[PDB]
Design an enzyme around this catalytic site. Sequence first.
Site, PDB file in Angstrom:
ATOM      1  N   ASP A  58     -21.739  28.530 -27.133  1.00  0.00           N
ATOM      2  CA  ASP A  58     -21.271  26.827 -26.461  1.00  0.00           C
ATOM      3  C   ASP A  58     -21.791  26.841 -25.271  1.00  0.00           C
ATOM      4  OD1 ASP A  58     -18.830  25.519 -26.015  1.00  0.00           O
ATOM      5  OD2 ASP A  58     -19.033  26.987 -23.863  1.00  0.00           O
TER       6      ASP A  58
ATOM      7  N   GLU B  72     -25.111  25.681 -28.080  1.00  0.00           N
ATOM      8  CA  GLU B  72     -25.209  23.854 -28.143  1.00  0.00           C
ATOM      9  C   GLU B  72     -26.000  24.055 -26.565  1.00  0.00           C
ATOM     10  OE1 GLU B  72     -21.915  23.632 -25.407  1.00  0.00           O
ATOM     11  OE2 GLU B  72     -21.921  21.435 -26.201  1.00  0.00           O
TER      12      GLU B  72
END
Length: 422
Positions: A173, A205
């Site tokens: 993340d 990400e």
Amino acid sequence: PSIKSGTILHAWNWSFNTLKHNMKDIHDAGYTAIQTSPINQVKEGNQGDKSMSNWYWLYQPTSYQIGNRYLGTEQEFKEMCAAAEEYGIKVIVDAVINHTTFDYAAISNEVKSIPNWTHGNTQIKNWSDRWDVTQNSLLGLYDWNTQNTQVQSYLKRFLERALNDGADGFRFDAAKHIELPDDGSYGSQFWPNITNTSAEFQYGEILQDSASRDAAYANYMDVTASNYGHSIRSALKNRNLGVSNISHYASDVSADKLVTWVESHDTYANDDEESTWMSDDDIRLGWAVIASRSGSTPLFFSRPEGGGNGVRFPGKSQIGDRGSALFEDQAITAVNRFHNVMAGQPEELSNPQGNNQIFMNQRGSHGVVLANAGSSSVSINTATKLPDGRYDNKAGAGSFQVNDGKLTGTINARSVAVLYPD
Ligand SMILES: [Ca+2]
Ligand SMILES: [Ca+2]
Ligand SMILES: [Ca+2]
């Protein structure tokens, strides 16, 4: 095959127990790995209410002990990974290690016990300054002091724990918000160190912009093709699948290190509702396009039961429950299998008879995938390398014929087609 070779089912908000129970179905759907939502302890805001609109609390860590009210206990996570393995399914964990919750009072003493563990909560201002993007806070979420070798071991220990509980990979993340070794004088060995685990597959990400350093991150992990996602969406919106706009990945990173999607949980569940508009057909079509591709790794986003056509949360389920049954749709799974069987084959995207509403991807001389974004059926007649014979559409009703290198047959409106020898 490996995780990188197959497709991934994003079991967004699916509890550990929900996953365990739908494991056989996930397998039969042709998915090689599933991605869970954050499995660590978080600030269960709004009184831990399970309304789907409260999906974002899972991204506000309070400690890195495993288990929370939304997904379940660390034991259930283990059992879930075990049930997955009974079917050869790999498990990828969404790791939120760039920051913690914004509420300093909710953070656990466990974290606060780490001397100088945070960069603070000063919200980023210049998204063009790698210094501000990596050293300051995202949305006010306390930014981990990743240059601190002690935080590194704490976070990496969490990852190592997940691997011991049965995890097989990670989704990092906000990976773009953690410096790399060469980011000026504030760089660190965070990434080189934490990516050194027994994980089989890991991607970060990294939403693209002038300073995302896509190629840079790819040296340590696979990356998200956010731009490509918008390219596909636009195509779906305009019902124009012309290959001049959806064949290039709009990234410096090559397919073999790319993770793709039609939409992400962010483009769907955030107040912006940028991808919320799509219907299931729009998804069947988009998935046919990206999952037919060679190299890249497609991520299927499981939407909330009844979600779509502009409505994010219709209230027909809550956090923890399974998403809609689209993940195991005939059109979707047929494409998953196509993706698996063709692995290793080259690709050739085109628009038969110059009709941009018709997408076609021919992999080597073994299989073909057609996608009709238009509102009318089309009798196709184009060149193909498939051996002569009859081909039943594995993605749905209908059949096609291949004679003297000629592919003929009708593709229904707003439909997908998947052909290849048995
Ligand atoms: Ca950071
Ligand atoms: Ca495993
Ligand atoms: Ca809406």
